[PDB]
Amino acid sequence: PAVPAVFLMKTIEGEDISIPNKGQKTILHFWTSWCPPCKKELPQFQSFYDAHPSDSVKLVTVNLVNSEQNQQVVEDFIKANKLTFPIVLDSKGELMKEYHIITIPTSFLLNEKGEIEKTKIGPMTAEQLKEWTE
Numbered sequence: 342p343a344v345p346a347v348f349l350m351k352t353i354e355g356e357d358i359s360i361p362n363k364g365q366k367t368i369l370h371f372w373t374s375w376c377p378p379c380k381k382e383l384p385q386f387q388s389f390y391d392a393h394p395s396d397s398v399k400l401v402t403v404n405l406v407n408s409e410q411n412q413q414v415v416e417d418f419i420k421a422n423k424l425t426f427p428i429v430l431d432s433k434g435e436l437m438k439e440y441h442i443i444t445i446p447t448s449f450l451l452n453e454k455g456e457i458e459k460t461k462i463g464p465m466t467a468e469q470l471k472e473w474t475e
Contacts, residue, residue, distance in 0.1 A: 390426040
């Protein structure tokens with residue numbers, strides 16, 4: 342990551358989130374609604390989130406809103422697809438900047454110190470997400 346820094350964000354569902362999470366591991370996921378590989382991968386993150394494999398791993402998800410039509414479109418998309426996992430909007434573009442995001446989907450496994458343990462470019466499965474948890 343470009344700079345050592347933690348992010349204090351309010352989730353789309355109103356929840357107060359950090360990245361990385363206090364004394365906890367983090368799965369960070371980057372996406373847009375129109376991205377074809379992200380679109381078919383989103384159910385994978387919903388499934389994984391619903392199954393809740395780990396208590397020591399936190400899923401935070403980042404929408405690249407500035408790569409979207411607008412924010413309302415994302416809102417509608419999340420609502421229509423019944424996406425319930427934590428979603429953060431990268432409104433200022435600091436997340437994309439800090440993690441040098443050029444490709445989506447991209448997922449990271451961070452430890453409690455914000456260090457990157459795993460990087461995955463391209464789609465994942467609920468099963469690979471669970472493994473990242475083990």
